[PDB]
Symmetry: C4
Subunit: 407 residues, 4 copies
Amino acid sequence: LPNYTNLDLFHRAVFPFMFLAQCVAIMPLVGIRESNPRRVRFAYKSIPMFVTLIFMIATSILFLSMFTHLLKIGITAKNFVGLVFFGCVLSAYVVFIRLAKKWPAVVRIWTRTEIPFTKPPYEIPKRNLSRRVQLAALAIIGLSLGEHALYQVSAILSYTRRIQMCANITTVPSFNNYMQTNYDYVFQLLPYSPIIAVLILLINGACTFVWNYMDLFIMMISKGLSYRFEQITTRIRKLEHEEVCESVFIQIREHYVKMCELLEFVDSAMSSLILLSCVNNLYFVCYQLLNVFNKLRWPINYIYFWYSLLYLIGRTAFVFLTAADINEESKRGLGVLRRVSSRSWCVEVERLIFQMTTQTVALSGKKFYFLTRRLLFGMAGTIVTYELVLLQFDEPNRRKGLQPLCA
Amino acid sequence: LPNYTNLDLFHRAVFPFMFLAQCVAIMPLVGIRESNPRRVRFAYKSIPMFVTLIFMIATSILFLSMFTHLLKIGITAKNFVGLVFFGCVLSAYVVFIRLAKKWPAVVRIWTRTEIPFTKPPYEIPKRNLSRRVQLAALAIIGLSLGEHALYQVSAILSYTRRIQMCANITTVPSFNNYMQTNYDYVFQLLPYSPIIAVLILLINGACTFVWNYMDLFIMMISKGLSYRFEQITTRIRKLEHEEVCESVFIQIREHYVKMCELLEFVDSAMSSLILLSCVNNLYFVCYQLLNVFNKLRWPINYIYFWYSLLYLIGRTAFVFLTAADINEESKRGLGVLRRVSSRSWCVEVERLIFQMTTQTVALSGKKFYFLTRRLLFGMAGTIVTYELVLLQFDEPNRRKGLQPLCA
Amino acid sequence: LPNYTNLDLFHRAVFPFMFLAQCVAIMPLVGIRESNPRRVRFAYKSIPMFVTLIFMIATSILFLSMFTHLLKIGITAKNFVGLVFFGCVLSAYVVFIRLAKKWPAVVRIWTRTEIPFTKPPYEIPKRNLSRRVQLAALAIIGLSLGEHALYQVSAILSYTRRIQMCANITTVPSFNNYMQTNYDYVFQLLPYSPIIAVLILLINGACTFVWNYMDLFIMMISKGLSYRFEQITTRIRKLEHEEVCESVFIQIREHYVKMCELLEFVDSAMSSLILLSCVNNLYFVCYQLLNVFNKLRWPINYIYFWYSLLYLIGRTAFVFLTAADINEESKRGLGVLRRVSSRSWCVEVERLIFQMTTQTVALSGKKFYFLTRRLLFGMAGTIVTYELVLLQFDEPNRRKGLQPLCA
Amino acid sequence: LPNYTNLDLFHRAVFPFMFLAQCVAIMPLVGIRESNPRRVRFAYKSIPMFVTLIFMIATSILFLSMFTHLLKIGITAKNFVGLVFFGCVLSAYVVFIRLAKKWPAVVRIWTRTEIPFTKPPYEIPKRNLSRRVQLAALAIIGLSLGEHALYQVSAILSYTRRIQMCANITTVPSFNNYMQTNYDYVFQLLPYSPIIAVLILLINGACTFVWNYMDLFIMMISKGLSYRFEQITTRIRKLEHEEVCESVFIQIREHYVKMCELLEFVDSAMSSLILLSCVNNLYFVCYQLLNVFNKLRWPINYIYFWYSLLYLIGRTAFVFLTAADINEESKRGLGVLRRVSSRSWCVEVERLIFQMTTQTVALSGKKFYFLTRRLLFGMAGTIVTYELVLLQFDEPNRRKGLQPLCA
Ligand SMILES: OC[C@H]1O[C@H](O[C@H]2[C@H](O)[C@@H](O)[C@H](O)O[C@@H]2CO)[C@H](O)[C@@H](O)[C@@H]1O
Ligand SMILES: OC[C@H]1O[C@H](O[C@H]2[C@H](O)[C@@H](O)[C@H](O)O[C@@H]2CO)[C@H](O)[C@@H](O)[C@@H]1O
Ligand SMILES: OC[C@H]1O[C@H](O[C@H]2[C@H](O)[C@@H](O)[C@H](O)O[C@@H]2CO)[C@H](O)[C@@H](O)[C@@H]1O
Ligand SMILES: OC[C@H]1O[C@H](O[C@H]2[C@H](O)[C@@H](O)[C@H](O)O[C@@H]2CO)[C@H](O)[C@@H](O)[C@@H]1O
């Protein structure tokens, strides 16, 4: 069996971040850190599943808290976002659990599909798969941490500044008063306690991490697939000005077909996650864009809002672009295959060219749409249309303006 | 001739529900229960056609009643739905009559097209065609019965609760007073009578059954076609890792071509029904979605509205997905055909792959659109756009709020 | 040379209606009635061109009259339609003149392209080209005459009924007073005279005929092309269950390629007319649809408005469907070519199937769009979206209601 | 080495206008006027880069002036256009700098790709590349000069007429007072001085030239590519009725593949410029179209507004059409290749036909969209939808009307 310890495999590239997600109980798999992907298994009776149940119970508690609070104070389009967040997070857990159920098979096939690309005539690119995954995942994680830190800083500064410059009822600033005020949707259902306060903070952080990790996981999977497609493209490019025997084209076509089979399997496994991430990203992007013209009190509020909006748009665009890189890489070999000489042309090259030309090699949202650059352009156009139609809805709200600080 | 009694044929699978629809005079065919599909014929002078004429006359009476009532009280976008319902139902009858005219030919060809798939190398899947049709049809019928029961319960409870808690003019609750009130659009044209009351109730039930049976029939036909396409895909999958002679590919391509010819014939026969069902579903889904934010008096009213909306959306999505399963199954064999070895590759495999790749194997609405997953995604996007643009139209109505119970 | 007198050619089919259009100076060609299409020529110094100049001068006079009248009374979205009409008509003349410039070449090639289809193995369908053109053109002409008659009747009845039931200033009804009132946009610039009145009526009738003849001419051309494509499809169908030699496929492919070349040439010639007709139809359909909810005084006003709206929508749909029948007929032979036996399969069948599959055989609006069923569906969706967005613009106008009859 | 002095090459065709753009420091390349394209190089330490830095510093000064002025007076959707202009211009500089970085490689490959087309069997068309580029560039430059002259004339006439017919506070017209008034967004940050006034006028002219030169450069590049594609199409047409040896098709396919490689390279180089130009054109076209119904004081104001709107729409349409001419020319050879005889048909013709049919030979905006006639039609439809939705936003502004002249 191959030595998985040092090989440049997808599982080795992604298992650190899969374990980081496990820490917040995202995808409950057993032995995700094992070097051999064959040792990855899904077990309902396991510590990861127990932590997942705990986190899902707590997220359900938070979702019920938000639902009851909004019912008490009435549901508004602006309030609803909160519920949606928790809803999405809960959905994510369920989706990821199902994904975990399918992950072993997937990872197994993935490994056995990518062993041929770890040996000649395929070479490791300048940026190996582990480095690509690390760079993208660290960027996403750092940006999400910055977004949540800005959220917390904006909330705390708004609360403290309101109290300080209120020049009216004081309610001296404190951790407990802030916890009861900003998170009143929770403590209006559960008795307040500092331990519960820290728990709610940690659980909100975990929910935010899950919310970002849906997109992060889609990104890592897209990198893993486009890496092998790029290796195939590079191998084909190496045949640019050479007479190529039929056997070379046979092997290239077989490897491309295996890569497409792996893409189909992974797409079937991940279609639910892709659909959930796409719908959640669209909703949140539209909601934040509808608030671009709103007026906020403090400069920190503007900083947080614009950082969140830009980060969300960039994360959506980056996930879509990373997923579409699979399609772009699949099509990139067509230009080199079209240069095959008349002497080297054979039935195998014709078959491969036909498959590259007519097959859509891309991740899909349950085959309702395919993650391509054209899809990202259409999503941008749809978002623009929705924003144009919706900015009329909130025009009265926009002209309401900032409320009095004292009130 | 083949023994139709026990064979796993489409006609055997669907004739129970076709006869159930005949009971409400949907598709007036003679000998629909006959085991031999060759004995199915369309006759204008027949009991099914007489019942169809009676039901169409009664539906025309109801439609005229609604038209005159709305003219008397003025036509509003909210009132119009009622007329549309009856209109659609009447259209359905006409469409189905035409479909009946074409059904014998269709069924005949269908039978002779599916005889090859009842013998090796094709095997019956885990869920045979009869079981698939039964499951889907029973689900649709039960959900429609639940929807109509909730409609009746909501109307009756609203009427009775209004009268009881009116604390004003009493008009003690009774069957006759409810019949005159809720169905005043009928009795404002016809003299009231309990027999006419029961007749109107039964006729409204029949109209609802027709309204749901358009989608149900499209679903059963889609199941019948995708069943044979799935059998072809399974047979191709059985050739995954074997050297295949040219004769096997010849037979596979011929069976696929026959299946596509059957799909073309059935699509030509059913294009009118598909178009009518699509337009009716779109209109009703948009109309119900425009009322999501409206305020209803009783919890039963909310239960009925949301059950109806969710059932309608799910029925539209399920019909579209079942129809698109034909296209998905047709394309599913391409992946296996792309794995054919260089030794087994021949002109027949190339022909079949070209046909699967470039031909759109799907039901269509008169070729204006094709029932695919992409079409369902586009329909969802179009519905979202229409709802966004239309929620401004009814904003004044939404802010009107609930009327006084006494008034 | 072939005997053009009795042959079933496009020129013989369409020249009666081309001459009818010449009577109103639409397409100024010389010798359009000649049996030999080679005798058709375009001459600037000719009676048709003189009549075209006279009609264009008259239409410019009417357009200037409308422009000055609207400037005097201010331009409104409702008034603008009038100007647009004349503008379109003027554009049509120019376009048709250019079309006339290209018609001889076109007709010549057309004739020499369709001679092979007048002899075996091609047979004349049940409805020959002359009968198809006659039926469609007579339907369009009769419906346009009915539309204009309803327009005149509605205007005259509105005027006379207003005067009669005014119960105020009388201005006894007369031809001259009606001419000065309804056509005040003309006589406000030119001194009134009964001769000028009859001239304005005749010139308005000619403008209406041109407005309808753009669509009519597109329809006849589409019939001419789809006729030969249908003949090709029928010839291919005749090879359904026969072993076919390579020569038969060679001839079929050559005839199909010649038909596609003729379609390309005709599309290049007629792209301007197609674009103008499409834009004019879209504008007028949207404008009329925006007035569906408006309230009109008399039942004749409703009759005229709804006849005009239904006729316009039906004419647009029929032109689009007739043009798309070319594409449908081109694709109809693919199903029969896919049934070719393995023994009869050759490079010629593969070439023909590839061309039918991948080539878009359809008329186009300068290649910006192609006249297909999908395009008609997209046009319907675009019209629905535009109407939804625009019904908000005229909501104040809709709630204005009918003006007082006396005022 | 080939004699570049007299050859009909792209670099010879475009270098005069590239140098004209260099005069305003658009694309800082060294030796752009050199007859040998191999002598074109990009150097940060060079006079072109120094002038580019000066112009970018000036444009940043103007952008900061506009930003501070709008902050002082509040940002409105109408004011924002100004900022956008400068922003785009600044972006253009950056983009063009990057383009300059890539230009040498590009031009080099371009030259070596187009040497084969300067010799038989390719002939120079009636309009050689230099003449096509000269005509289009002179048209664009003259129209831009007219647009800016109309802008300046409208501003000056509005200012002078206001002062003269004010009949109130006079502030006798002068160059300095006009400079301080119309360009108050500048002098509100920098102390006024006539030298600074002339500098601001010249720098605004340079910014306008850059704004138009983005589209102009895209146009010239599109002409350069479609020229060679048209030469290929003409060479193929020359084989219309001849038996063609396999070697001729080999050479034609190789030249077509080289042209497609050049298109891919140029598209990769110019995708940023195409995206920026497309977004800027869309924004400005929508903004100007939103002001069509606004009321302006003087006839010169209407003349300037409509000249600017028509010129902008025509420039967008012309850039899109010139870019799509590459795709149209690539597809134009398919019709002639489909006429190849059965005797001359070979694997090379099949390969070439497959590539022309299935490959999208067009410039693209980073592969998010492709510059085709269909894309221009979709852009027109999107603009219409945006204008319909947006005309509701500015309806209050439209009904505000013209402000008092004295105020
Ligand atoms: O809207 C994006 C933000 O979502 C989360 O914020 C939660 C918050 O944690 C929770 O207390 C409240 O009930 O709902 C919001 C979302 O509506 C993230 O914590 C933020 O970083 C995001 O900006
Ligand atoms: O709107 C969906 C409902 O359609 C039917 O309800 C009819 C009703 O039977 C009839 O009396 C009235 O005139 O019109 C409505 C439809 O507008 C079904 O009976 C209901 O189950 C559906 O919910
Ligand atoms: O709007 C469709 C109608 O167009 C013509 O009507 C003209 C009319 O002849 C002319 O006097 C007036 O100035 O403008 C209208 C069009 O705006 C046709 O004559 C009518 O048949 C059409 O209904
Ligand atoms: O809007 C198109 C116009 O853009 C430029 O005009 C500038 C102007 O030079 C500058 O002083 C001002 O600050 O902004 C506008 C653009 O918003 C061109 O100079 C004009 O020719 C164009 O019409």
